[model samples]
Every structure is written in structure tokens, then in C-alpha cells.
Target chain A: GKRILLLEKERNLAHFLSLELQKEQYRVDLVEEGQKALSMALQTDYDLILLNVNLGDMMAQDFAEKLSRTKPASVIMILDHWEDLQEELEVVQRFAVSYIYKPVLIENLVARISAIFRGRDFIDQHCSLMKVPRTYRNLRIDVEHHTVYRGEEMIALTRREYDLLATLMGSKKVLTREQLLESVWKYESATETNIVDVYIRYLRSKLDVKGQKSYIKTVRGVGYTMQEG
Target chain B: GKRILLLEKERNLAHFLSLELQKEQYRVDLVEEGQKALSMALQTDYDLILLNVNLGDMMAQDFAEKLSRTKPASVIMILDHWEDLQEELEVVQRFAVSYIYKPVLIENLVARISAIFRGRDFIDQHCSLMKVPRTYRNLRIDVEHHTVYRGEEMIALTRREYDLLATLMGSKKVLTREQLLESVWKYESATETNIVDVYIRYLRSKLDVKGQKSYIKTVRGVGYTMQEG
Candidate 1:
């Protein structure tokens, strides 16, 4: 059994959350607003905190921004909608455990939070990364030494794809698709960014297509991360 | 997400198992019967395999007896009504991780499969049913908190130091000078100077033993990546 500090403005929402969390055997301290929630959280060390994005009195985001540092707890933000994925990801990058899209089922909400607490993905499979001499999926673009490892051995790489992966790999966080298109085809006359997509697909297929594991992730609104099993 | 391989005689049963498994983020491949499972098992390694006991042409127990040695790392069993009970030692008596009974409850089936996928075997209750290590051997390492856990104690790390370690550990997260500057020294930004190189030396000296068990790998001109044992 764990404890959750619930900061929701609405009484109905608070009740709904508290009731659901209670059913899951979590001890929840329900606060209607962020200011009150802030004070309570300051005094209490909790396993997790659910902060509603738009709390009435004090905005929950600003409060969370500070409390995240002062408090030694993990926070999951509750978003109204997917209307602002960029800003939301920024928040997620900042310090929150991860944000939850609202109007969420109790089970789904619990699943993601459980993932954070368990230090595993929601599926409970270990969130992993591959690291070796050099290679992701199939392409062996080693950034430090700028080398590429092909199947069983090394392969020569174009300066451009090598540079592209070098540049993108630097930012482990997600990069926007627009950013990649502009950077990769800076002086080129490729009308469509599909060129980038095609290259990525080629790299992915060549490197890990048959591997039964994901090595690249296409972030819906953003660009991609070298995600793998 | 965990992937499952199902070899069954009846199309309806395969469809049923896939539905339940899919809800748990398991990519289930259903073959018409036992031969199909055997063939697929030979070609691709799966997180788990669900074989039908009363398969049209082959017997599950007999097939399991033979298949157990094919790839010694997978969880193989006959799908039944209560997959959980079949996981018990008394039923199979030979370290089978799980089983599924006929006409499954979708949610519990998903939970059990998910639970088993996360390394909790139905039999051991403490050990992993699915050998998570064998599937993605070179990619994912189990250093607790993603770094330096020889046992109970964690290797000391400052914030930037930890990020550097994490970036190296990931298969695709090769940090360039600029990228490291962007992510690690964000608040007190660092120029794309030799700071990245300096820190690598620092991290390496701390973690590497006589440079032997050297976890941080360098890629000549590119950057560094992490390798798991």
C-alpha cells in the first residue's frame, strides 16, 4: 500500500480520485487547490502526487515547478486535453514523473503511475536501451568515434546520414520532425520531408526490421527517438 | 510491450488469446496449430509462448517436452482455462512459468500475462518466468537506477554525471558535445567545449576498474555509449 497526495480543485473530481485511489489501497490526502496542496505536500512525504493542470486558486503548474525541487516526491500532471502536446512535453521534461491525458480511466491512470513507481514501463517489461561497440537496430553510427557498424561488421556511411544521426542522437529527448527536415536537408532541394522519413525507414529496416524489437520511435507530434526493446 | 507466440489448432482460440494478450501490449502471433508454433519458434524468439494442450495434430505436453530444449530461454506452456493455476509446480513439475485455461477472463488474462512478462514467473513468485536477459542480451543492462549498482549500494553520481551515464547506456542515445550541452548543463549552460570530454574521463575513472569492466565505451570520433554485462 502506498500514499498519494491528490491536488484537485473540484470537489467532485477530488472525491472521484480519492474513491478510486482508495479502492486501489492507496492512502490519499485530497486537497481542493494547489496552495493547500502545496502546504500539505511540504509537510508530508508522499510516494506520488497527482497535480491537476488547471487548479482554481493557485495555478498547479507553477506550484509544481517549485515544489518539484523542494519536495522529494514524484509528480504526474493531469492534462485537460492533447491541445498542447509541446508545452506538455516540456513539463514532462522538466521534472514531473510523466503526464496523464485527462478523462482517463482509473485503470489507465493507475497503470502509468504504477509504471513510474515500479521503475518499469506500464507493461512491466524493463524499459531498455542497447549499447555496444556501435549500432542501433542495424546502423552502426558511433558518435564518439564517428563509426558505423553494419551487419556482423562495419560499413561505410555517408557523411550526411552520419551527421544527421550524430546531431539527433545528441538530444536524447524528442526532436520535432520539422527540426530534422530542416537540419538534414539544409541546402538540399527536397520538397517533402518524406525524404527524411524514407532515409529513416531505410536505416530502420536495414538495421532492425526483422529484429522483433523497436529501435526507433516516431513521436506523433515531434520527431523520433532511437527507441528499442 | 511484451510479445507472445501462440501455436494452436483452433482459429477461434488463437483469436481469443490474441485479444486478451493484445490488451496487455503483447504482440501475439497465432499459428493454426502445433507445427506452426514449432516453425515460428525456430525462426523467432518470443517473450512467451502459448501452446494449446489439445492441439489438433500434436500434444502440448509432448511438444513442450521437446520444445523446452529448443531455445532454453522462453516460457512455454499449454493454453487452458486458468493459465495461473497451470503455472503451479504441481501441475507441470518442470519449471513452466504459466498456463491459460479455455474461455479466459480478458482482464485477468492480461494481468497474468503482463505479470509474467515483467519477470514474475507463476511458479517462482520471485524469479522471472520469461528470461528477459536472453532475448535482449547486449542491449539492456540491469544496473539499478540505470547505473553503477554492484549490489545494494549505488555508485555516487551528480546530476550531470548521471545524465552522462544514462545517455551512454542507451543504444541510440549517443551524446554529441552540443547535445550534452543542451541537456546536461541546461541551467548553467556550457559551451560545446571540451567539458564533455572532461566529464567522460571523470565518469570513466569512477566506474571503470583499471579500465577493465569498462562500461562506458568510446566511439573514436563520435562519442561514447554504454554496454551491459
Candidate 2:
């Protein structure tokens, strides 16, 4: 069961909504005024914050911004009037996950809450799976820890060097200089910058062995590729 | 000069803003109501719509939604109050390109409008460049027209076959069945679906010459690749 913080100016509506949310097995904390809600939100961990855009004291965006900076909870705004939806849109985009109108059905509110939780679970699962290390031949790059190893020895690399290597190793085919510039250096347009070539020389000097061919191969007029010779 | 539609309920503000916009070498059309604004937007091709979120009669979102469906203009929402920023976020995310709070400076408003037009121009240039056809060897795909041609003759293909071929040709490396499935069919998870293989077979039957080997190659125990075999 998830915890919810119901912040509403209307006493009756807040009480009723909190009771309904509790009935659905969600731990509910009902409060009026933005200042009180903000203080409580900073101290406690609430899964969801059901907010009424019309706060008595502080502005909703102010409270939202503060909460967003300090905590990791999804805010669901409750619009006082349907006409105020234009403003509600801004709040939802910046701070809250979603919103419901003032005259909201309990079922719809519960359903929206459930959907947000389900979405969060799916995203969390996907992100955790993405933490796996990337490997190419004798080199292994631990993306999560931002470290790389060659055979039994750990390779010390600069930030740009690490990023360039990771990008090259992530792909199976040859990557053009333009592609490398865009991916590693974040350059938006094509340039005659020979910076990529300069860095490749540095990488080869560090990674290449005495009697063996370099791990990174130049495809003549094409680009660079990581292949066993 | 760019054209702008100024939608504001306050007569004084609307008049002042429209005058300022006109002075900036932008053609300005001022409207006070959502209905009038929506009608004007549909009838004319304005470069930007400077909207006041607080409409006297109809909701701002309704006007935005209707205008978005018919018009190809950038929307910059004008908020009546700083407190209303929360609601403004939702409108900006859904319809508007950006927003500005009320009691706005003429210089600030002009700057924001100029920035929007500049961004639109850059996007237009980038999109026009993207309309160039994608090619692999002798096969040409006119993505803008959704048509494919093999050398001299036009190749009529099913939607799935066309998508599979486009996916294969887009990448220079070997793409696994899972990668093809995800990119072409939009499947989020891995499955035992041989839909990729079936589509590839269909494409080979149509695109491959009788005497020569197929353009699409299968990597044993791996996936598929497009090459000059």
C-alpha cells in the first residue's frame, strides 16, 4: 500500500478524499494550507501528494518547486475549477505527475494513482537492467561505476577518453568521425575538427601492446572500428 | 517579418502588447476572446500565437486544442499571475512552446518571441534535410513519400516488409532479431516471435534478384545485416 498526502483548502473535500484513499488501503495524511504541507513533505516520505492548486497561504508552484528539490514523491494536482486547467497544465508538467478535476470521482482518482505507481515500477525495472557492463574482446567497461579494465589490469582513462571508448565499444560497426563527434563530444553540426583523430592517437599509445596490432582499427576513408586483427 | 496573434482579455494589455509586437517588425493580430482567437487562428497562418491563459468565456485548453489540430503556429502562453505557473506548466507541455508571466517587460516578450521563431527556422531547415531519401546499395527508400525503388524498377511492398527493410538498411551493423523486433514492431520486451524472419523472407522474395545472392545477410547464431554480398 502507498502513502498519500492530501493538501486541500476545502475542509470537507479533503476529509472525504482522505477517507476514500485510506479505504483503498493507502495511508492518507490530510492537511490544509501550503506551508504546513510543505514542511511535512520535507520531513516525511509520501508516495503521492494530492494537491489543490488553490492554496490559502503559499503559491502551489512555490511549494511544488521546494518539494521537488528536497524530496522524490509524485504530486497529483487537484484543480478547483475546470477553467483553471490551463494553469494546472503548467503545475503537472513541472512538479506533478498528473491531475484530477475538483469534482473528481473516487474511482478515477484511485485508478490514476495506481497507473502512476505501475509506470514507476516499470521504469525502475528497465533502468536497473541498463546497469550491465559493456564488453569488447579483452576490454570490459563498467558503465555503472564509470570504470574500464583491460585483461587483468584496470585502465586509467580521462573522462573524454572513457566516453569515446565506451561509445566505440557499444557499437559493433565502424563509426565515422562525424558520428563520434556527435555522440562523444555532443557536437550538433559537421566540422573539420581533427580532435577525434588526435584522441585516437592518445588511446592507441595507452591501450596497444608491444608486439600486437592496435585494438582500434582505421577503415581508411570510412572511420574507426574495434576489431581483433 | 513574422506574424503574431495576441490573445488577451484585458483590453489595455492587449493593445499595448500588439503595438509593441508591431514595432518589432512582426505583423500582429489582437483578439480578446477564445472563440474569436480560435476562428482567426484557423483562417490565418500566423508564425506565433501569444495567448493569455485567462479567457473570459471559454477555457484556454479548448482554444489551444482546436488551434493545434488545424494551425501550424508556435504558441507562447501569457500567464496572468506568477502564482498560476503550476497550471501554466501543463498548458506549455501540451500545447504551447513556452510561457511568460504577466506584468511582462516589452523587451523580454519580444526576445522570447524572437527566440521561438529562430528555433522554428532551425527545425524547418533540419526537417527539410531529413526529407532526403535513405539509401543502401541500389535500393532507394523515399521516406517522405513512403515508397521504395530497386534500381530502375519500383518495388511495391507491404507496410511490414517496408519497415523491416528500412530498419535493416538504416543500421550499418548486424541487428539481432530482438533489435529488429523492438525497432520495427515496437515491441518493448523480447519474445519468441519469428515475425522478423517472416518479414525478411517477404522482402527477399521481392527485392533479391534471381541469379545474385540476397542483399540481406543472416549472421549464423546471431541476427541479420544488409551488405553488398
Candidate 3:
């Protein structure tokens, strides 16, 4: 069961959303005041935060901004009316999945929450800046910027190439050709394509630097390992 | 059922944690020594590793680095006092979700573990390449191939255009233009560029079929949203 920290002012609205989420076997900790929500969020990390734009003690948008800045969590903002308040909140505007209008549709809201939960895996695993970017020798990969650097110069990459590099750098263990193909391609089953090697060549060409030191090494019959100095 | 590997030198702490985990229907494999924990972790894939930073035989930081290298898993390190050993453990500092201090609150520990488990599924599904390409109606976007298709005809895109489309489609709900810009452009704060709109036109010209159908819609005063057919 997923734990959610919900900060909404309306009792009926919170009750309704809680009931629906509860029906789906989700554990929700509901709070009416922004202060309590902030305090609770600070102490405990939640899977998702269901926040309403309008709150009693403090603005919900304000809480979202503060909570995310200090203690980052996946957030879904429930708006009073869509456009006005959303643009004001920087963090929510930048990272949140989407905002829902009042007189919220139960079915659609639930589905959206699930969708946010489902799709955000890409950003979390591949896009999150929470972890310090990997650096080996002079080669650096910034996950937040989605930029690659060799010494002082920058190397531009296509989406596939960038994701491939990130997966290799991010993984603690050696990556097999199969694993690389799956992570980079989103391939469900096995592939006979040399897509993995093709991308590896592309990355090595860019990052390997004058063909002197190979940062990425093939494990001969096993997998590929990112060499660190 | 979720599985956890409990690596700790303290018998009382391990027993208490195991009992609590069992109550929550988690299967826990407990080991007191660091080497034994490493051996067992190698053989089995545990969902979360509950580690005690201080161990009798070897430092748990060393163990964390090794286990994650060969077999990656989510880790939550229990600290002796919180600050003393935290600075020295590079693996824990970077990879572990969050750490808890001694006099471990039973409820909080369970909640933290549950929170990590619940949220990680989202990343596993949406973020992993294990899942195939994203498809919407007749439109399919392949991240690996870095191609967008309308039925069988492939629509070519620059890296920017493709990332923008992927961001909108992969999101749980409609994305505001501001959200789209920050995500795709990596615009540090706010930018005045009509960059999102310009790209929407680019995508629409190629993808909007007969121009009669607008796949991406302007949200009045807000931002552009990807419309579902």
C-alpha cells in the first residue's frame, strides 16, 4: 500500500478523496492545516503528496514549494481553479504531474494519481538531480542538466544516447547487453538488434577522449563496466 | 510479498526489526556479520536492505558499496548517532533513500520502509526500459528508437522536439507550457521564450495529420497541453 500526505482544506473533499483512495487500498494521512502537513511531511517521507492549492492556515502552493525544496517528494497539486494559482507555484509548475479542478472527478482523479505514480519512474531513475552526478577522471555526466562533459567541452546527445549513458553510470553493477537494450530501448522481450553495441560505440566515441583511455569496458561474454580512476 | 535483508551487529535491534517486518508480512533474512550478509545478499535479491552502519567484523559502508555493485537494492541505513559515521559512508550518502537514527521508532521505521517500497514501483514501471514504447491511439513514441510514428509512417523530430513530446505523453496528465519548458529545455528558472509554443507548432506541422486536428492544445492563459484522441 502507498502512503500519501494529503493537505486539503475542505473536509468533504478530503473525506471523499480519502474514501476513494482507501478503496484502492492506499494509505492517506489527511491534514487540514498547512503547518501540520508541512511538519508531518518533514518528519516522514511519503510516496505521493495530494495537495490542494487553497489551505486553511497557509497557502497550499507555499507548502508544496517549501516541502519540495527541503524534503523532495512526488507531488500532485489539486487546484481551486486551474490556471491562476498553478503558475505562481514554481516547484509545482516545474515538477508536479498535473493539477485538477474543484468538483474533482473521483474516477479521473484516481486514474491520474496512478498515472503520475506510474510514469514518474522515468524521471526518478533517469532524471532526478537528488543524487550527485557521476564523475570519472575528466568525464562528467550531469543527470539534472541532462548534459555530458569531456574535460571543459560539452558533448550533445540524443535522448537514447543520454539515457544509455545515464543507465551505465547510474547502475552500481555491471550492465549486460540485454540490460542496456532494455533500459535504453524500453524493449519488453529479447532483441537480436545490435542497438546496445551501436549506442555504446556512439558514447565511447564522444566520451572516451582521443581513444586513449576507455572509460567503458566490455566484460567479454558477461557485461559492460564503467571504469573509474 | 516483499523481502528484506537485515544486516546488523546488534541482536536486539535485528530481532525487533525482524519482528516488526514479519508483522507487516515481509520476509526478512537476518545476518549479524558483514561478510555473511554479503554472501547471502549475493545469492538472493532482496527488495530493501536494512543496514546498521556499525558492524563487528567490517564497516557496513564497505558492504553497501559491494552488494549494490553486484546486486542493486534500495537501502536504508540505521545510524549509530546520525552524523558521526554518515560523512564517511559515500555509498550510503549517495544511494540510500533516507537514514534513521538509533532508539529507532518502530512505527516510523515501518512507515519509511513502506514509503520507499510503494514509491519505487512507480519508478520500476514508468522509468525502466523493461516496459515497451509509449503508444497513444494511432501515435506511438519509441524512446529507444528515438522515433515517433503515426500508424506506420515515422515522423522525424530533432532531439528537442522528441523530448518535448515524450515529456507531455509520459506525464500522468496535461502539462502546462511552463512545465514543458523547464522539463525539456532545462531552463533554470522561468524563461520568456515562446519556446514551447514554437515546438508545438513544429510537432503539429509534422504530426497533426491534416492540420484540422490539433494534437497539442493551448490552455488559454496557461500553457500548451497534449490532447488525447
Candidate 4:
């Protein structure tokens, strides 16, 4: 299993990368805010770190400084913005191994991270904006590994059900029901009956709502939203 | 019986909700403040946890952060303001499930609360309305990932067949042939066909009861019902 740190601001893109990385069996953590990521970096160790210039929490430069102080095995930063190159240069001087540009291809991102673990040079040659730390949490969604435990008991889900729920988490913000069917399921239209409703029920059964509240909610006049209680 | 844990500064709301939930056959526990809620969760197991955003000693977000890590309760965050959502992203990410947007609607809230007890996700009630567990047998759907599972393993369905199956497979209840076709293929303003029946047969071959006889049951004069017999 591979561990990756994803430092991206756009929620959609981050989850997209996370899903692709997860499918490839990589453990990915997403850090939206740069400060939170740096703090997390202080506590945990990661295999590879992905840094973004403009993260929600702190500036990429600031994050990079903190990360450089205590670096991971490998690190890569994406420059979607440009500013304070000197600050970035100082951070890079310490620990950053690679700097990439925008429009990051899935193949390139994957290959570059993979190459890092292989101890090869996949780091970019140029410096862009700033850099920060990347992080990931362990969450698996396949059939055999899919259940969310209430203690040791397994929670079950159907194909569409899991796909739909994961798609919501896969999405950064609110994902419409229409988008869910097509994006997660490749379907274009809506279901006749309360298909989504039934699956949510299944999730509730297995998600430890016994001592907790339901995780999914209906927005009403809209679609679904996932909250804890 | 449903178990509800309420953390509120206003004893009146807690008392009122407790009565409603009690009448609905739910066991209710109300805490006067966030500190108490946090403290109790360490020693108790609760189904739905409702707490205010602004509490006497600590902010709800701070409590949620601590609560999520220590307790297994699903906490519903109550915000007296719309702006609370923006300020509490981290807490929301961790614990806050459903939010009551100011001047709460008890009826709407009650319906949503009970709906959770029935294992329906508040966000995805459309899926909840399907009521699959009550109707379908053996096969369970994972709403987030969108795949079917027989017991614990994934059961794969071909492309179009997946579309057809998922179309009928949702809902906590049963669906008729006409409804399935219309939902699956947008038969609303189009021609009616036995395509639904054909797909049902296909599903029956795949998901029908194991060792019994059938999975999708024929209602004689009615359409089809999928359940374990």
C-alpha cells in the first residue's frame, strides 16, 4: 500500500485524485488548509507529500517552511499560483524535491508519486508558487473491504448504494442526485422509485447509528447531503 | 427502540423534543450544556446527538472535535445562524451531521429524526423512501459506491443490466413493471413495453433467492417484489 499527501484547494479535483489514487491502492490524505496540513505533518509520517500553492488554511510558502523543517520521504509541490518565489526558493532549498505546474495529468501525478517510492528522480525541474504538506486518511470502499464498522460488526451496501455514498464524499461540495447517477454510475437519467432513499437506509443500518446519528440527510426540494448526526 | 441524546442550553427545547421522541417510542437523554454532552459521550452510547453551536462553556465546534474523537455518537449540530456552517467546517467534517437552520421546524425535524430511526439518511431520503431492506432479500446495496453485494462480496451486473437492475432495485418497497420501465428508460411520454419484465428475469437469474426459488417475486395480479422468501 502507498501513502500520499494531497495538497489541493479545489475540492472536486482533490477527491478526483484521491479516488484515482485509492483505486490504485494508494493511501491518500487531503489537506485543504495549508496550516492544518503542516500541523498534521508534525504528528504523522507519510510516504510521499503533495503540496499545492494556494491551500485554504495557510499560504503554500508558509506551509513549505514548516514542512521543510521536518520533511517526509518524498515531496512534490504544484504551483497553480505565483507569488513570493524567494520564499518558495528558501523552502525548496531545504526539502522540496519536485515542483510541477497546473493541469496535472492523472498519469503524471501517479507515475511521479510511484517513482518517488522507487527512489528515482520524478521531481519537477522548476519552482512554481509555493509548497505545503500533504496528508491522507485510511478509508476503503470495495466490496470485501467496504464495511464501516460499528465496533466489529460489518455494514453492507449494494453497488449503487456504495457508489452513491462514496461519490458524495468523492465530491468536494454538494453533489446533485443527477450528477451522482451519471458520475458514480455512468447513468444519465433519474430513477423512477426512491432508489437513493433505500441505499441510505442500508448505510444507516451499518454505520453505527445505534450509538450515533445518521450520516446522510435530505436537503428537501434539492437532493441529499451527508452530515454526521 | 431509538436512542436520542440532546445537548442544549435551552432546557425547554430539549424537554419538548424529548416528549415528541418519547411519544414516537424513542428513548431520549437531554444534557443542559456542551461540556456535559462531551463528558457523557465518553461513558455513554447514543444514536442521534443534538447539540447547539454556541454553548455556555465551549463552542459547539470545539466540543464536536473532542466528542468525535472520544465518543461514538452521531452528533447533529444545531446552529442559530446560517453563518455557523462557514465557521464550523472542521467540526462539520468530523462530527456535525445534520444541522437545524435556526428557528427549527419541529414537525419537519421530527419527520427527519424518525426517518433516521428507520435507517434513512436525512440527506438522501429519496433513497430511504425506497425501503430496500423491508422489500429486498439477501442482496444489499452500497449507496455511496453503487454496487450490489450478496452477503459481503460484490455481485457484478453488466452495463445495461446494471442500469435496469438498479432502476428496480432501489426503494424500501416494491415496484411495478410499468413504473420500472418508465424510471429506467424515461417511459414517461414514450411507448410501453415488456422490457421491464425481461430485465426482471435477468435480475432474477442473478439476485433471486439462494437455494429457495426466487429473489424477485411476482405479485400475481401486481408487478414484481424483490425479497428473500
How would you encode candidate 3's per-residue C-alpha lDDT over A3-87 as one tens digit per residue?
8888766777778989888766678998877788888877876767777666677766567666654443335455555564555
Q: Can you give the DockQ of every candidate in the order shown?
A: 0.02, 0.01, 0.02, 0.01
Q: For model 4, how does the per-residue alpha-carbon lDDT over B1-229 read when each residue is reduced to its tens digit?
A: 5677776666676678778777655678877766777777667756677776777788876776565453423335464556765676544533454456656766666766654443322222223211223124566655433356777655544223444455545543466667655444441232556756766676666665556867666777677755546
Please provide TM-scores computed only on chain A for all of the candidate models, following their numbering. Answer: 0.47, 0.51, 0.51, 0.44
For model 2, chain A alone compared with the true chain A gives a TM-score of: 0.51
Q: Candidate 4 at A116: error in angstroms?
A: 59
Q: How many collisions per candidate?
A: 26, 11, 4, 57
- The deviation in Å at residue B175 for candidate 2 is 9.2
TM-score of the B chain in each candidate versus the native B chain: 0.48, 0.52, 0.52, 0.49
**Model 2: per-residue Cα lDDT over A64-127, one tens digit each:** 7666554423344555667765665654444445556767776777767766554443232221
Please list the residue runs of candidate 4 whose C-alpha ends up more than 4 Å from where it truly belongs after superposition: A1-229, B71-73, B79-94, B119-229
How well does candidate 1 score on lDDT at residue B92? Answer: 46
Q: Write the per-residue lDDT of candidate 1 for residues B1-229, one digit (tens) a residue.
A: 4668877556775677687676544688877767777778777767777765555676665555555444433466555645534544343423244455667665766666565554322111111112233112222333333334434434444333555555444335565666555444443334655867867776676566553556676777776766444
Candidates' lDDT values, in order?
0.55, 0.64, 0.64, 0.54
Positional deviation of A2 in candidate 3, in angstroms?
Answer: 7.6
Q: What's the lDDT of the predicted structure labeled candidate 3?
A: 0.64
Whole-model lDDT, model 1: 0.55
